[PDB]
Amino acid sequence: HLPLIAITRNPVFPRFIKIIEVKNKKLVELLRRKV
Amino acid sequence: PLYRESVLQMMQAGQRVVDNPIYLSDMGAALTGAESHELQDVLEETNIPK
Secondary structure, X not given: OOOOOOXXXXXXXXXXXXXXXXXXXXXXXXXXXOO | OOOOOHHHHHOOHHHOOOXXXXXXXXXXXXXXXXXXXXXXXXXXOOOOOX
């Protein structure tokens, strides 16, 4: 039950490492909640 | 190297802040050492791809 992610110009092809750098900190709150 | 790369790091295509691409490409064409007349000749071009 998580909001649809903000891709914000970051394609992620299957089986391919990729980096995402959103400027908002609310997703960081989700990142700390998942630990 | 001529000028600092930090302006290139400031305006990246992945940050979604690049609201005026022609100005970024002109800012990138400014680094060229070509003579001012060559720049005026590029200004004579009207079509964007040209």
